[PDB]
Design an enzyme around this catalytic site. Structure first.
Site, PDB file in Angstrom:
ATOM      1  N   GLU B  61       0.853  -1.205   0.010  1.00  8.34           N
ATOM      2  CA  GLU B  61      -0.010   0.021  -0.029  1.00  8.34           C
ATOM      3  C   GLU B  61       0.800   1.354  -0.170  1.00  8.34           C
ATOM      4  OE1 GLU B  61      -2.534  -0.641   3.708  1.00  8.34           O
ATOM      5  OE2 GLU B  61      -0.977  -0.678   4.952  1.00  8.34           O
ATOM      6  N   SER B 130       4.442  -6.748  11.551  1.00  6.44           N
ATOM      7  CA  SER B 130       3.054  -7.608  12.187  1.00  6.44           C
ATOM      8  C   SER B 130       2.159  -8.643  11.101  1.00  6.44           C
ATOM      9  CB  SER B 130       2.450  -6.116  11.694  1.00  6.44           C
ATOM     10  OG  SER B 130       1.499  -5.856  10.563  1.00  6.44           O
ATOM     11  N   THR B 169      -7.655  -6.330  16.061  1.00  3.81           N
ATOM     12  CA  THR B 169      -7.293  -5.500  15.070  1.00  3.81           C
ATOM     13  C   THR B 169      -7.474  -5.805  13.999  1.00  3.81           C
ATOM     14  OG1 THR B 169      -5.943  -4.347  14.005  1.00  3.81           O
ATOM     15  CG2 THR B 169      -5.708  -6.559  15.392  1.00  3.81           C
ATOM     16  N   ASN B 196       0.952  -5.201  21.332  1.00  3.99           N
ATOM     17  CA  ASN B 196       0.250  -3.706  21.273  1.00  3.99           C
ATOM     18  C   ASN B 196      -1.007  -3.922  22.762  1.00  3.99           C
ATOM     19  OD1 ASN B 196       1.834  -2.847  19.436  1.00  3.99           O
ATOM     20  ND2 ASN B 196       0.468  -2.696  18.250  1.00  3.99           N
ATOM     21  N   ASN B 218       5.848   3.169  19.786  1.00  2.00           N
ATOM     22  CA  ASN B 218       6.082   2.910  18.954  1.00  2.00           C
ATOM     23  C   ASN B 218       7.672   3.467  19.539  1.00  2.00           C
ATOM     24  OD1 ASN B 218       5.155   1.738  17.682  1.00  2.00           O
ATOM     25  ND2 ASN B 218       5.337   3.309  14.969  1.00  2.00           N
ATOM     26  N   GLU B 244      25.908 -12.746  20.287  1.00  2.00           N
ATOM     27  CA  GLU B 244      25.821 -13.244  21.687  1.00  2.00           C
ATOM     28  C   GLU B 244      23.879 -13.579  21.979  1.00  2.00           C
ATOM     29  OE1 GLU B 244      28.400 -12.700  23.474  1.00  2.00           O
ATOM     30  OE2 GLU B 244      26.859 -14.144  25.138  1.00  2.00           O
TER      31      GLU B 244
HETATM   32  N1  LIG Z   1       3.384  -0.775  17.408  1.00  2.00           N
HETATM   33  C1  LIG Z   1       2.933  -0.422  16.339  1.00  2.00           C
HETATM   34  N2  LIG Z   1       2.216  -1.344  15.237  1.00  2.00           N
HETATM   35  C2  LIG Z   1       0.710  -1.124  14.680  1.00  2.00           C
HETATM   36  C3  LIG Z   1       1.073  -0.330  13.859  1.00  2.00           C
HETATM   37  N3  LIG Z   1      -0.216   0.099  12.749  1.00  2.00           N
HETATM   38  C4  LIG Z   1      -0.198  -1.331  12.879  1.00  2.00           C
HETATM   39  N4  LIG Z   1      -0.108  -2.031  14.412  1.00  2.00           N
HETATM   40  C5  LIG Z   1      -0.610  -3.317  13.950  1.00  2.00           C
HETATM   41  O1  LIG Z   1      -0.637  -4.564  12.063  1.00  2.00           O
HETATM   42  C6  LIG Z   1      -1.517  -5.110  12.435  1.00  2.00           C
HETATM   43  C7  LIG Z   1      -1.869  -4.109  11.200  1.00  2.00           C
HETATM   44  O2  LIG Z   1      -2.077  -4.467  10.146  1.00  2.00           O
HETATM   45  P1  LIG Z   1      -1.425  -5.032   8.908  1.00  2.00           P
HETATM   46  O3  LIG Z   1       0.219  -4.544   8.624  1.00  2.00           O
HETATM   47  O4  LIG Z   1      -1.957  -3.548   8.391  1.00  2.00           O
HETATM   48  O5  LIG Z   1      -1.420  -5.247   7.779  1.00  2.00           O
HETATM   49  P2  LIG Z   1      -0.549  -5.693   5.929  1.00  2.00           P
HETATM   50  O6  LIG Z   1       0.349  -6.626   5.313  1.00  2.00           O
HETATM   51  O7  LIG Z   1       0.033  -4.139   5.701  1.00  2.00           O
HETATM   52  O8  LIG Z   1      -1.065  -5.520   4.735  1.00  2.00           O
HETATM   53  P3  LIG Z   1      -1.556  -3.842   4.002  1.00  2.00           P
HETATM   54  O9  LIG Z   1      -2.241  -3.352   5.190  1.00  2.00           O
HETATM   55  O10 LIG Z   1      -2.370  -4.191   3.058  1.00  2.00           O
HETATM   56  O11 LIG Z   1      -0.209  -3.555   3.648  1.00  2.00           O
HETATM   57  C8  LIG Z   1      -2.308  -4.861  13.509  1.00  2.00           C
HETATM   58  O12 LIG Z   1      -2.219  -5.706  14.279  1.00  2.00           O
HETATM   59  C9  LIG Z   1      -1.601  -3.466  14.190  1.00  2.00           C
HETATM   60  O13 LIG Z   1      -1.970  -3.391  15.588  1.00  2.00           O
HETATM   61  C10 LIG Z   1       1.843   1.014  14.284  1.00  2.00           C
HETATM   62  O14 LIG Z   1       1.802   2.275  13.893  1.00  2.00           O
HETATM   63  N5  LIG Z   1       2.568   0.848  15.782  1.00  2.00           N
HETATM   64 MG   LIG Z   2      -1.785  -3.357   6.762  1.00  2.00          MG
END
Ligand SMILES: Nc1nc2c(ncn2[C@@H]2O[C@H](COP(=O)(O)OP(=O)(O)OP(=O)(O)O)[C@@H](O)[C@H]2O)c(=O)[nH]1
Ligand SMILES: [Mg+2]
Lengths: 69, 429
Positions: B61, B130, B169, B196, B218, B244
């Site tokens: 994306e 993620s 989520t 999270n 973050n 290590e």
């Molecule tokens: N620590 C942290 N976790 C995030 C953040 N944004 C999303 N997450 C987590 O990542 C997951 C969201 O799924 P995505 O990573 O957006 O799905 P994707 O694999 O990227 O697929 P696309 O959206 O099509 O690119 C959820 O579990 C969120 O809690 C962030 O900004 N910081």
């Molecule tokens: Mg995503």
């Protein structure tokens, strides 16, 4: 004392050579920064000129009312 | 002549990478323009003048990669290290593992090769994915396999943001998490499970911020990773080289899923009424409440504990404190590991992020614990999986993208074989 007089020769010559090369590299970086302004400005000019020309074209087209003889 | 290569695939990865590069640039005196008004570990000089980071930013994306392409760091990253496709992952693993990435992996791996060609003392990789998502799962596991078949001996860490225990989520998150956990079982040497849900708890209680957001989360993740890498980066009376972790916390070849923790994460005014010595700071470090992951270590056995201290630390109190913490009966280790600690020291005190909720303090500890209670998490997660595979829910969105259906079965069964290890190693000799 002679070998120190000579090692300082080597050291000064090298620490001048390296600064000179770094200066050359910085000058090349500046030359590229300068070259970038040409593609930064010619595109702006062409964009504004296309805007003006196509706006004038739209005007000339729209400026066709009716005759009514 | 000692450096790493950080990959941020998926969506959460690029976010935590944004925060982490913020922190790195800000401690190293590196301006957001890449010009200075220790960095050989992370950054690299472009011959003269400015710095550039060692990283690759993957996503499908183009939203977030564009947002960083015109954000505050538009003039820091090499524009060839930000790879954004056309279509989206859509939370289904096979979309980012068989169809879309099928050729994007070529470009990404060629860029990784071009980076590694320039590295001089490369140690390992720091990936971010993620797994709850689609692209961070599919593309992430595919890159993992590609690097493991390409380079080999080089270590591979990871900082995975698993699905929370309770809060939701996404609904398809068990599928594309189990698939990536099956594809990550061997190619990665160290998995550091981040969740999270526990960090929301912490930010709610300790940092006193009632309405947190992924920004602060973050920030905290960046602080943890910088406290981890301070060993390589700056000076330390007792340093550890990243290799290590690959040999201190992986007893058996398959089990390498550990959880992290940090201390002291206390707001300013709440820590003003506190002395924060090594004793209390390490006694709080082991506290199951403030673990980054989510589990109940009091209900399980420990297996290995790396503890990197940073700041002005007195070693005698370190050893005294670790002795008294091994004295406790509630915290117990397994039979086959009597020397259940591995510590390190870095003289660099923690750096605060300007505008960060975290408070400035001299002594900080970062713990990485390979435990055996985290096992239950998989079980619980597997739980969800079964309640979906009992009726082949959502499978057609996966079988439509070339993914052979049977894979699911194998994974969910083979991942269950992890228990055959876990519930075994928890048993004494
Ligand atoms: N620590 C942290 N976790 C995030 C953040 N944004 C999303 N997450 C987590 O990542 C997951 C969201 O799924 P995505 O990573 O957006 O799905 P994707 O694999 O990227 O697929 P696309 O959206 O099509 O690119 C959820 O579990 C969120 O809690 C962030 O900004 N910081
Ligand atoms: Mg995503």
């Amino acid at each position: 004392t002679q070998t120190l007089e000579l090692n300082r020769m080597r050291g000064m010559l090298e620490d001048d050579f390296n600064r000179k090369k770094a200066s050359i590299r910085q000058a090349v970086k500046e030359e590229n920064q300068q070259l970038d302004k040409q593609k930064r400005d010619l595109e702006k000019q062409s964009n504004n000129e296309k805007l003006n020309y196509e706006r004038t074209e739209i005007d000339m087209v729209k400026t066709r009312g009716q005759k009514r003889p | 002549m000692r450096e790493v290569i950080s990959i941020h695939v998926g969506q959460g990865g690029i976010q935590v990478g944004n925060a982490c590069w913020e922190l790195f640039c800000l401690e190293h005196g590196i301006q957001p323009d890449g010009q200075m008004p220790a960095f050989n570990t992370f950054f690299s000089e472009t011959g003269a003048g400015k710095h550039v980071p060692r990283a690759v930013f993957l996503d499908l994306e183009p939203t977030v990669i564009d947002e960083v392409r015109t954000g505050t760091y538009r003039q820091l990253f090499h524009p060839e290290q930000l790879i954004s496709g056309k279509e989206d992952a859509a939370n289904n693993f096979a979309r980012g593992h068989y169809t879309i990435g099928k050729e994007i992996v070529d470009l990404c791996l060629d860029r990784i090769r071009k980076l590694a060609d320039n590295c001089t003392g490369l140690q390992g990789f720091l990936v971010f994915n993620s797994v709850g998502g689609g692209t961070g799962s599919g593309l992430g596991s595919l890159l993992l396999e590609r690097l493991s078949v390409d380079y080999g001996k080089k270590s591979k860490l990871g900082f995975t943001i698993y699905p929370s225990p309770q809060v939701s989520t996404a609904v398809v998150e068990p599928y594309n998490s189990i698939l990536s956990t099956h594809s990550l079982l061997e190619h990665t040497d160290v998995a550091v499970m981040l969740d999270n849900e526990a960090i929301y708890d912490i930010c709610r209680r300790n940092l006193d911020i009632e309405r947190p957001t992924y920004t602060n989360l973050n920030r905290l993740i960046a602080q943890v990773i910088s406290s981890l890498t301070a060993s390589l980066r700056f000076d330390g009376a007792l340093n550890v080289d990243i290799t290590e972790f690959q040999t201190n916390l992986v007893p058996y070849p398959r089990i390498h899923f550990m959880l992290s923790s940090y201390a002291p994460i206390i707001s300013a005014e709440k820590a003003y009424h506190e002395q924060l010595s090594v004793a209390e700071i390490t006694n709080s470090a082991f506290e199951p409440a403030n673990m980054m992951a989510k589990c109940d270590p009091r209900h399980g056995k420990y297996m290995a504990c790396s503890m990197m201290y940073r700041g002005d630390v007195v070693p005698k109190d370190v050893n005294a404190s670790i002795a008294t913490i091994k004295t406790k009966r509630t915290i117990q280790f397994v039979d086959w590991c009597p020397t259940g600690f591995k510590v390190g020291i870095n003289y660099q005190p923690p750096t605060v992020v300007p505008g960060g909720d975290l408070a400035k303090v001299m002594r900080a500890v970062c713990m990485i614990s390979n435990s055996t209670a985290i096992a239950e998490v998989f079980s619980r997660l597997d739980h969800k999986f079964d309640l979906m595979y009992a009726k082949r829910a959502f499978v057609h969105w996966y079988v439509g993208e070339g993914m052979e259906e049977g894979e699911f079965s194998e994974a969910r069964e083979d991942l269950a074989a992890l228990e055959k290890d876990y519930e075994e190693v928890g048993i004494e000799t």
